[PDB]
Structure formats: C-alpha cells, structure tokens
C-alpha cells in the first residue's frame, strides 16, 4: 500500500484497503476520515442517535435496508433542523458536499464547480468578506 501511495495510484490503494481481511493495516485510530459536526443553529454535536435508533428499529421490524438510508448528518435531532441548503441553488443537500474553507459553506459539486470555473468567480456564493479563490 505504501508502494501504491508512492505512485499516483490512490484509488487502487483505496480498493485494496477497503476489502482487506486485516483490519489494522494502515492506522490504528479506526475512523480517521470521520468529520463530526456541531449544529449551526443550536451548537450541540450532530450525532443523531435517536434517528439511528428509530431507523434501526424500523428496519428490524421490516425486511429492507433502504429505510436506514434515511439516516444522515444533514439534520439535527436536538433542535429539529430540517436540512442543509446549498450555498448557490438553496436546494436540499444529502449525499455529497463541497466545503468552502474560510467561511464554512456547503455546496454540490456541480454548483460549486460552475460558480468557480464556468462563471470564473472568486468569492463565496453566500457573500463573505474575503476571497475564496479558485
């Protein structure tokens, strides 16, 4: 895996490490790519344990795994926040985002890519006192 990392072959290394029977090959901290968030409205941590418990109970009483796909970290259970909105199109955002670093705003791949390449703009779509260039 280090040899694969030495070349620019990272997706191949991800394929190799994803289905490795040895669970402690690279890293011993477990989830090193986990990004836990605090809520933008109430400030408590987005863990959503009640929603996970309810969806696990519903998927145990039923016979489908698609109910558990309703679980996500785009909503808060403490303050009942509904969804996270895109910074450009203001649509719900559930599966893949694109974080703008200095200001902390989400966005789709297509929206952020259009705003920063097709329109050749340099600021955040939400409006921020700075330049989030390229």
């Amino acid at each position: 895996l280090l040899l694969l990392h030495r070349y620019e072959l990272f997706g191949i290394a991800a394929d190799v490490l994803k289905y490795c029977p040895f669970e402690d090959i690279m890293g011993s901290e477990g989830d090193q790519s986990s990004i836990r968030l605090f809520c933008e409205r109430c400030g408590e941590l987005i863990t959503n344990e009640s929603s996970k418990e309810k969806l696990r109970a519903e998927a145990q009483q039923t016979g489908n795994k698609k109910i558990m796909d309703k679980f996500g970290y785009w909503y808060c259970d403490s303050c009942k926040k509904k969804n996270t909105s895109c910074v450009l199109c203001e649509r719900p955002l559930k599966k893949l985002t694109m974080v703008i670093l200095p200001c902390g705003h989400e966005g789709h791949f297509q929206c952020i890519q259009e705003w920063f390449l097709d329109e050749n703009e340099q600021e955040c779509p939400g409006g921020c006192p700075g330049v989030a260039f390229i």
């Binding site: 929603s51 996500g72 808060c76 509904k82 969804n83 203001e90 649509r91 719900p92």
Partner: protein
C-alpha cells in the same frame, strides 16, 4: 395558443406550476397524476411520469417549496391527502418516479383544496373539505418525511353541506415572511382571513364581505414589497372582487379589509382567478368562454386588458 394533450382519460381538474415554472402537475378524474417537464432544447411539454394516486377523482394538488425537495401533495374525493416524493434514480414514464410518503386519513369528508405553506413557516400544509374543517399538517420530524402531525384543526362551517348541494372550498396562504402567518380560507359563501396568535393557535382575523354566492377561487397576490396586501376572489356570481388588505386580542397585528374593485365583465361564474409573479396581472376565467387579463393603470384601480377566448 399551442395545445398539448396531457393524456388523461377524464376531466383534468387541477393544473399547478412548481416554483421554477418548468414543471406542471395535472390531476384528473381518471385517478392519475401526470408530471410534465419543459425541455430547454425541444421547447415542448413532455411527460415525465404518470401514476395512479387515489381511489376517487383528484381535485387539488400542490407543489412544495424546492428547498424541502420535490414533494407533491394531492387531495381527492376519497377523503385522503397523499404526499409524493420523487426519487431521481427511476425511469421516466414508468409510474415509480414518485414515491408515496404519507396518507392523511383524518378528514371525515371529501377534500377540495390543498395548499402548501410558504417555506419560512416550515413544511406545513392545509386541507379543506366538505365537512367545514380546516386542517394543518406539519412535518416536524426531519429524519423522515412520513410523519406529518396535525397541528391546527379549525371549523369554518358549523355543519357539513348536504349531499345534493354543490359546494366549493379554496385556500390561499400569505407569501410574505415579514407579516404574521395568515391563511385565506373560503367557505361556501364566506371568505375568512386567519392569523396565528401568540398562543400558537389560529384565530379569525378578518372577513372579506360581499360574496352573495359560492366562491370558486381565492388567490393572494404575491408580496412584492408594497404596503397593501391584495386578495382576488372569483365567485359563482360574475364578480371578480379584489380586496385591499392593510396591516399595522391574542393577535400580533390587526388588519383592515377594503374592497378595492368589483367587476362584472364575465356574465357568468368566475371559475378561477390567479396572479402573476409580481401580482400585476390578474387572470380570470368565466362561463363566457373568455379568459380576461387585468392590470392596474394610473391608479390602484384594476382595469381590463387582453381577452382570450377558447
């Protein structure tokens, strides 16, 4: 006037646009909902999905705000409201493009109108049927949009209308986030403006007078920034009543009703009245086969314009 055939086997009852104006949903008495899309290249209305929804004639459908997703509510005469969410990983014109969310079985009467609330009030909903009960449903659970809880339950009519008498019920929200929550509710011949009081309950705020016969359609003019709210009303008479509402016990702010204008140009029943995006064009349809457009020239008084016959 280019026509496109929607494909229903019976009478198309309610046609509604979405927020962006590139999608229309048509419900009919063939117990079907058809969603059409406007391609930017072909510039023609093509069908996206058609699926069976209810066990009776669907008479009112409405789109949700696009910030909550793609949700279509649907009221029919089988005393149910069904909520339809769209999963984009399904084939068009297959019947599985729009997935069912909930069934609102609380109505003991055939429902006539359903309107979604404005997006700043949450994912709320309104119901009105032939039992005189106005029902508000909120989606208070953010994890799944299948648990819609009834919040408010008013009584517009004292008793339900009889079996053999015709009745019409229309709903209209106030699309202003700088005013308290209002809901223009039409009874048989009574038009009521509601308000959300400080106690969290709906209260009767104002009553639009006149309305000697059945009210077919109520449309609140969009709040463009003007200091007066406008309500358009189509009656079973030939009257298109436009009310000028100015806002200044257990209500946030009192409000007055002034009948701005009243027009008898249709010589029939004004079946529908609708507004533009800016509330500058009033479209009214009557029994004379004519669709009339209305504008305000040189003053606040509304004057007629282009008349479209069909």
């Amino acid at each position: 006037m280019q026509p496109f055939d929607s494909g229903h086997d019976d009478l198309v009852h309610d046609v509604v646009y979405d927020f962006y104006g590139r999608h229309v949903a048509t419900c009919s008495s063939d117990q079907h909902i058809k969603v059409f899309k406007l391609d930017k290249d072909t510039s023609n209305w093509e069908l996206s999905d058609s699926w069976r929804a209810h066990d009776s004639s669907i008479v009112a459908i409405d789109w949700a705000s696009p910030e909550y997703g793609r949700i279509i509510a649907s009221a029919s005469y089988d005393k149910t409201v069904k909520l339809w969410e769209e999963d984009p990983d399904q084939e068009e014109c297959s019947g599985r493009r729009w997935n069912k969310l909930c069934t609102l079985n609380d109505s003991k009467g055939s429902l006539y109108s359903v309107k979604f609330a404005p997006a700043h009030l949450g994912l709320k909903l309104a119901c009105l049927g032939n039992d005189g009960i106005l029902r508000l449903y909120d989606a208070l659970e953010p994890s799944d949009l299948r648990s819609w809880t009834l919040t408010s339950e008013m009584k517009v009519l004292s008793i339900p209308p009889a079996n053999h008498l015709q009745s019409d019920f229309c709903l209209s929200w106030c699309p202003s986030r700088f005013s308290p929550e209002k809901l223009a509710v039409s009874a048989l011949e009574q038009a009521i403006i509601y308000q959300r009081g400080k106690d969290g309950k709906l209260h009767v705020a104002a009553k639009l007078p006149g309305h000697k016969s059945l009210i077919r359609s109520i449309s609140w003019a969009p709040s463009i920034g003007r200091w007066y709210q406008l309500i358009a009303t189509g009656c079973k008479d030939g009257r298109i009543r436009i009310f000028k509402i100015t806002e200044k016990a257990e209500l946030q702010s009192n409000l007055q009703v002034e009948l701005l204008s009243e027009h008898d140009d249709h010589n029939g029943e004004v079946w529908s009245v609708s507004w533009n995006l800016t509330g500058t064009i009033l479209s009214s349809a009557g029994d004379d086969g004519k669709v009339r457009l209305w504008k305000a020239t040189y003053s606040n008084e509304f004057k007629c314009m282009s008349v479209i016959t069909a």
